[PDB]
C-alpha cells in the first residue's frame, strides 16, 4: 500500500469536480482531487462567462475556475496534479494508476469532462500543430492580421469566431447549415461582425480538405452540401469546433457507456449520479450530452458528492 | 391580461437561473417573484457551499446578485403571487393578484415551504417562540432553553445549530432512532452525552404553552403509553420537513407527495412535466438534494428545455 488511499477520490478540476470537492470537504470526507492535464477544465479556454448565475458582469473563464480552486483549497481539499491513465474497478478499494503515483479509494467521482472532436480528415491530422487547432485562445495570437477559418456552428465555434475577430484580418466561419445552434445573443454579436466587421460566413459548407505546403496551412477546400460543388478558400489556419467528446477512454469495458458518455441512474428518487458500478459516480460533461453548462456541471457535481456520502455511510 | 412567450414562477436560484438563460435566448422572460422575493436563501446568514465564492457570502447577498444578473439581461420582474392556474387551456392562463397572466411555455420553480404540525397552539405562537427556520430566529435564544421537533436532516442539523447558542436543546422525536445522514447523527450523539442536546424519543408535541409574551413551555405525549409530560422552553422549532409549494397545481400536473414529476433521464427534456410546455425546476421537483447549486442547475435545464419547445412551435 504505497498507494495513496482516501475515502473519496475526485477526477477532474472543472466545475463538476470542484463543486464535488466543496460538498465533500463539508461532509468531513477529506476528499482528494486529481486535476488532470488541463487544470480548471474547458472554462479556462474562454474569456467571457456571462451565464454563471450570481456574477452579473465581467466574469472570465479562468477567473471563475481560480475562484473554485480557492474555494476547494480553503476547505482543505488535497489537490493533486496528476493524470490517471489506467483504472481497476474489479477490486475494492478502487485502484487508479497515474503518471506520478497510484491512488486508492472507496468512493470515486468521475468528472473528466470532454475534449474537442476532430473531423478525422487525413489532411486535418497532418496539419495539426501547423495550422489546425482546437483552441482559439491557445493559438489565436499566431494569426495576427491574417485570414483564419473556423469550422462549426455551435456556441464554441461562434465564440471562437468572435474571439479571433479581434486578432485576425479575416475570420471565415464554416458551417454545414444556414443557421447556427449558438445562443441568440451570440448570433446577434456574430451577425453584427458579419455586416460591419471582419467575419465572413460560409453556410451550407463542409470542410473537404486542408491545404498547405511544408510550412503550414495555405487554405481549405469546401464542399457545397446541396450541389456537391467544391471551392477553395485562402487561410493561414483552421480551428475545428465541431463539438466535444467525453474523456472516458480509460473507463471502457468497466463502466456502462453510450456514445462515450458514462450512464448514470438519474431519476427522481436520489442516487442519480450512480454509475453501473456501485460506489462510483459521474458528473458534468462526462455524463451529460444535452445541456453541458458550467452551472449544470456544478449541480451534478454536488449530487455526486452527496450520493458518495450516502454510499460511504451505508458501509460497515 | 398580460402575455409572454415564457413565464417563470419563482425568484429563487432555479427561477433566476432560468431567467438568465432564457433572456440569452431572446425569449423575453417574465418572472413572477412570489411573496418571498429571493427564495429560501434570503433567510440564511452565510452560504459557504456556493461554488466559486470567497468567504463571507450571505444568502440575501447571492440572491441580490442573481436578481441584478436577471435584470441586466432585460428580465421583466413582476412582484406578484399566483393563486389559480388553468393548464387545460393553451396558452396557459395564470390568475394572480392585481393581474392575470398568459404564456406559451411555463417554468415552475415555486420552491418548498417548511411543514408545521397543525396544532392550534402552534399556530398562535408563530413568530413568538414557534418557527421553522432556526437561522432567522436563532439569535433570540442565546443561553436559553429551546425545543426541536423532528427526527431527520432538518431537525438534527438545526439541533446542532442551536447546541452552541442555547443553554440546552430538547430534541423531540416520535421514533426510537433518527433518520439523518450518519455524520449528522454522530455530531448529534456526542452532544447528547457531552453537550447541550437532550433526547426525547417516542414523544409527540402535544401542545405549545405560553402567555401573551412568548412560549414558556411545551407538553409532550408518549407515543407508546399516551401519558403526557411537560417541558419548560422559551422557544419551539418545528423541523418536520419541507412541503413543495404546489397546492395550486393539484389535478393539472402529475405529482407525487406534492412534488411535480418530471421526465428526468439522460436524453434531454429532463424538466418536462406531464403537460407539454410546462417545466419544473428546483425544490418543487427534487426531494433528495435541495441545494442552491442543484436548483440553479435545474433552472438552467428548464430554460433550455423551454427554448426547444418554443422553437418547435414554428
Ligand atoms: C470554449 C468554451 C467556452 C465555454 N463557455 C461557457 C460559458 O460561457 N458558460 C457555460 O456555462 N459553459 C461554457 N462552456 C462549457 C463548459 O466548459 C462545460 O460545461 C464545463 O467546463 C464542463 O465541466 P466539467 O467539470 O464536467 O468538465 P471540464 O470542465 O472539462 O473538466 C474536465 C477535467 O477533467 C480532467 N481530466 C480529464 N481526463 C482525465 C484523466 N484521464 N485523468 C485525470 N484527470 C482528467 C481535466 O484535467 C479537466 O480539468 C464552454 C466550453 C468551451 C469549450
Ligand atoms: C434556513 C435555510 C438555509 C439554507 N441554507 C442553504 C445553504 O447554505 N446552501 C444551500 O445550497 N442551500 C440552502 N438552503 C436550501 C436552498 O435555499 C434551496 O434548496 C433553494 O433555495 C431552492 O431553490 P428554488 O428557487 O427551487 O426555490 P426557492 O429558493 O424556495 O424559491 C421559491 C420562490 O418561488 C416563489 N413562489 C412560491 N410560491 C409561489 C406562487 N404560488 N406563485 C408565485 N411565486 C411563488 C417564492 O416567492 C420564492 O421566491 C437553505 C434552506 C433554508 C430553509
Ligand atoms: N457561452 C456558453 O454558454 C457556452 C459556450 C460554449 C459551449 N457551451 C456548451 O458546451 C457544449 C459544447 O458545444 P459545442 O458548441 O462545442 O458543440 P455542439 O454544441 O455539439 O455543436 C457542434 C457544432 O458543430 C457542427 N458539427 C458537428 N459535427 C460535425 C461534422 N462532422 N462536420 C461538420 N460540422 C459538424 C454541428 O452542426 P449541426 O448543428 O448541424 O449538428 C454543431 O452546430 C454545448 O452543449 C454548449 O451548450 C456553452
Ligand atoms: N439539505 C437537505 O435537504 C438534505 C441534505 C442531505 C440529505 N437529504 C435527504 O433528504 C431528506 C431530508 O429529510 P427531512 O428531515 O428534511 O424530511 P423527512 O425526510 O420527511 O424527515 C422528517 C422527519 O420529521 C418527522 N416528522 C414528519 N412529519 C411529522 C409530524 N407531522 N409530526 C412529527 N414528526 C414528523 C419524521 O419522522 P418519521 O421518521 O417517523 O417519519 C422524520 O424523521 C433526508 O432523508 C436525507 O436523506 C436532505
Amino acid at each position: 500500500s504505497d498507494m495513496k488511499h482516501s475515502k473519496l477520490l475526485i477526477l477532474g478540476s472543472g466545475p463538476a469536480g470542484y463543486t464535488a470537492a466543496v460538498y465533500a470537504a463539508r461532509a468531513n470526507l477529506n476528499p482528494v482531487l486529481i486535476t488532470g492535464m488541463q487544470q480548471g477544465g474547458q472554462l479556462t479556454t474562454t474569456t467571457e462567462v456571462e451565464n454563471w448565475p450570481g456574477d452579473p458582469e465581467g466574469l472570465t473563464g479562468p477567473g471563475l475556475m481560480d475562484r473554485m480552486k480557492e474555494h476547494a483549497e480553503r476547505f482543505e481539499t488535497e489537490i493533486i496534479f496528476d493524470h490517471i491513465n489506467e483504472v481497476d474497478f474489479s477490486t475494492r478499494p478502487f485502484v487508479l494508476k497515474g503518471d506520478a503515483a497510484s491512488y486508492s479509494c472507496d468512493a470515486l467521482i468521475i468528472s473528466t469532462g470532454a475534449s474537442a472532436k476532430y473531423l478525422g480528415l487525413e489532411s486535418e491530422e497532418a496539419f495539426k500543430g501547423r495550422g489546425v487547432s482546437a483552441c482559439a485562445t491557445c493559438d489565436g495570437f499566431f494569426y495576427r492580421n491574417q485570414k483564419v477559418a473556423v469550422v462549426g456552428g455551435g456556441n464554441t465555434a461562434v465564440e471562437e469566431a468572435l474571439y479571433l475577430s479581434n486578432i485576425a484580418a479575416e475570420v471565415h466561419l464554416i458551417h454545414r447549415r444556414d443557421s447556427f445552434r449558438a445562443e441568440k445573443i451570440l448570433i446577434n454579436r456574430l451577425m453584427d461582425k458579419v455586416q460591419n466587421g471582419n467575419i465572413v460566413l460560409h453556410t451550407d459548407r463542409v470542410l473537404d480538405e486542408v491545404l498547405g505546403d511544408e510550412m503550414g496551412v495555405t487554405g481549405v477546400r469546401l464542399k457545397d452540401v446541396k450541389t456537391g460543388g467544391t471551392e477553395e478558400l485562402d487561410v493561414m489556419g483552421a480551428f475545428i469546433a465541431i463539438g466535444h467528446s467525453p474523456n472516458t477512454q480509460i473507463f471502457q469495458g468497466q463502466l456502462d457507456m453510450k456514445d462515450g458518455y458514462i450512464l448514470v441512474k438519474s431519476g427522481l428518487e436520489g442516487n442519480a449520479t450512480q454509475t453501473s458500478v456501485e460506489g462510483i459516480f459521474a458528473a458534468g460533461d462526462v455524463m451529460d450530452h444535452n445541456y453541458r453548462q458550467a452551472i449544470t456541471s456544478a449541480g451534478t457535481g454536488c449530487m455526486a458528492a452527496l450520493d458518495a456520502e450516502r454510499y460511504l455511510d451505508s458501509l460497515n
Side-chain angles (χ1 to χ4, degrees), chain A residues 1-56 58-316:
Chain A
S1 48
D2 189 16
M3 223 156 299
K4 171 70 150 46
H5 181 73
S6 59
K7 276 186 171 59
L8 179 60
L9 187 62
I10 305 176
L11 300 183
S13 55
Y18 270 136
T19 306
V22 172
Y23 274 82
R26 299 247 301 176
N28 197 28
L29 299 183
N30 300 101
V32 180
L33 185 143
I34 311 302
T35 64
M37 210 84 66
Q38 183 182 51
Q39 301 177 7
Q42 304 169 50
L43 278 178
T44 61
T45 64
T46 184
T47 64
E48 289 194 5
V49 176
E50 291 288 301
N51 47 20
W52 180 253
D55 287 63
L59 187 64
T60 62
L64 182 69
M65 296 315 301
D66 282 331
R67 286 165 42 179
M68 285 194 175
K69 183 184 178 184
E70 169 206 359
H71 194 179
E73 280 178 334
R74 179 160 46 90
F75 293 159
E76 300 179 8
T77 299
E78 181 168 357
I79 294 185
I80 298 183
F81 172 47
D82 199 340
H83 173 77
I84 302 304
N85 53 77
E86 195 184 34
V87 301
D88 183 8
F89 295 161
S90 65
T91 176
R92 294 176 183 266
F94 308 114
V95 179
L96 302 88
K97 306 292 216 309
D99 295 327
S102 298
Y103 313 91
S104 196
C105 62
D106 298 314
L108 178 66
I109 297 181
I110 298 177
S111 54
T112 49
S115 56
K117 301 176 188 171
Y118 280 100
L119 288 166
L121 296 177
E122 209 177 17
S123 60
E124 178 194 40
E125 171 66 27
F127 289 103
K128 285 186 176 178
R130 295 165 46 205
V132 174
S133 173
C135 167
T137 58
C138 308
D139 314 327
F141 69 101
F142 279 8
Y143 311 95
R144 187 164 53 105
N145 194 259
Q146 264 166 347
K147 309 189 194 66
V148 296
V150 177
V151 179
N155 280 319
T156 296
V158 179
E159 287 183 4
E160 290 187 337
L162 294 172
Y163 175 83
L164 299 169
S165 167
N166 309 321
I167 300 181
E170 296 184 19
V171 177
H172 297 266
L173 188 54
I174 320 292
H175 187 35
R176 60 187 180 188
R177 318 196 327 268
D178 41 60
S179 64
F180 305 89
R181 62 169 45 181
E183 283 182 322
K184 297 295 180 54
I185 79 166
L186 260 49
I187 307 300
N188 294 336
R189 292 168 56 184
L190 170 69
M191 296 314 176
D192 186 80
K193 292 270 191 171
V194 170
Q195 299 193 52
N196 313 311
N198 56 337
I199 294 190
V200 178
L201 295 179
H202 293 268
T203 51
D204 294 339
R205 294 300 184 273
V206 290
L207 179 56
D208 184 63
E209 186 179 1
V210 181
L211 308 179
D213 51 56
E214 297 216 7
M215 279 202 56
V217 176
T218 66
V220 294
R221 183 183 304 116
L222 309 178
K223 192 179 71 173
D224 198 322
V225 307
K226 299 158 300 184
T227 72
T230 47
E231 67 178 328
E232 227 169 71
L233 179 65
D234 294 315
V235 290
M236 295 286 95
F239 290 85
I240 311 301
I242 63 174
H244 294 266
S245 181
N247 299 314
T248 52
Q249 295 78 12
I250 62 179
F251 309 114
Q252 300 179 334
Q254 307 188 59
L255 291 177
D256 218 339
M257 271 171 286
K258 178 183 179 300
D259 298 329
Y261 293 90
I262 297 182
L263 300 188
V264 297
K265 168 176 168 56
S266 183
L268 304 173
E269 293 297 320
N271 206 27
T273 55
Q274 164 89 117
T275 71
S276 56
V277 175
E278 298 185 13
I280 295 178
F281 311 88
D285 285 0
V286 81
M287 39 77 66
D288 180 18
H289 69 79
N290 307 281
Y291 307 105
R292 293 171 284 181
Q293 300 294 318
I295 188 66
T296 58
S297 304
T300 315
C302 169
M303 304 177 184
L306 301 185
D307 293 341
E309 173 194 358
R310 299 162 190 174
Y311 167 80
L312 291 177
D313 295 358
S314 65
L315 303 184
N316 304 330

